[PDB]
Write a protein that binds this ligand. Structure first.
Ligand SMILES: [Zn+2]
Ligand SMILES: [Zn+2]
Ligand SMILES: [Zn+2]
Ligand SMILES: [Zn+2]
Ligand SMILES: [Zn+2]
Ligand SMILES: [Zn+2]
Ligand SMILES: [Zn+2]
Ligand SMILES: [Zn+2]
Ligand SMILES: [Zn+2]
Ligand SMILES: [Zn+2]
Lengths: 157, 157
């Protein structure tokens, strides 16, 4: 459940969760000195027993402490945007905001629900989409572009 | 009051105590995500107020948590022995035991109290020390080597 992104430079093992094997998300530390994503360790306790997965030391959920030092470090690590075509690199803490604006993120056309990269979305929606809505010059009827021919050949004019 | 030893490779800032500026000794972490030697932060609280010295966030001694993850990391860091002439490098956790056996550690002669490196101790004690005890061939009197000449001319023979 940890951060599944591409770190660059590569993520150091000290920041990896022993359970999910990815960058610690909401890092917490045990009394026996082991770091885990809050979600992974909790699930391990409420499932594999009240012990640390790495050394079987007895562990209680109320003994965990938030490792904010680790969290701050991880969130400052340089990551690459996953979107195809994008070459932006940024600190992890800024990746979420970025993805909401990245022009390379896939998006579904509101008319034909097919997926397209954001930078192409306006061209698709207004020039290529077979389901884009257009109006008849004669009766002002609105239809899907792909249905225009059959409408025009039999329009009440 | 942190570990004052030469790390090699050099100690990373992340393991340095903001207060004493040395490797964290008995590392503890605050709610606001900052690490400190347990002794330094407690002294800071019981002296500069109930707050983290780095950001002034309110801090209570009972809010600190032992950062055993950091402790383990720091104790596994390679360090150089401080004794002159020694070239041994080892993990910090082994330095203490090493110093108790290092041949380059200074030591006081039990007879003249002067300091000497351990590898030279035996030679000093038995062959050079002016205060080494020696017996008279005539009366069996024990005296400091430096006082032997005088003693010949002052028997009881
Ligand atoms: Zn995890
Ligand atoms: Zn453990
Ligand atoms: Zn991007
Ligand atoms: Zn479409
Ligand atoms: Zn029409
Ligand atoms: Zn300190
Ligand atoms: Zn702080
Ligand atoms: Zn040594
Ligand atoms: Zn001596
Ligand atoms: Zn004598």
């Amino acid at each position: 459940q940890g951060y599944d992104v591409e770190f660059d430079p590569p993520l150091e093992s000290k920041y990896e969760c022993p359970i999910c094997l990815m960058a610690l998300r909401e890092a917490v530390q045990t009394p026996c000195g082991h770091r885990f994503c809050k979600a992974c360790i909790i699930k391990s306790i409420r499932d594999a027993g009240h012990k640390c997965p790495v050394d079987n030391e007895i562990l209680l959920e109320n003994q965990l402490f938030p490792d904010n030092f680790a969290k701050r470090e991880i969130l400052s690590l340089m990551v690459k945007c996953p979107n195809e075509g994008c070459l932006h690199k940024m600190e992890l803490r800024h990746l979420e905001d970025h993805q909401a604006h990245c022009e390379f993120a896939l998006m579904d056309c509101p008319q034909c629900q097919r997926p397209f990269q954001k930078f192409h979305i306006n061209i698709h929606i207004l020039k290529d989409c077979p389901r884009r809505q257009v109006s008849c010059d004669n009766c002002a009827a609105s239809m899907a572009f792909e249905d225009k021919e059959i409408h025009d050949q039999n329009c009440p004019l």
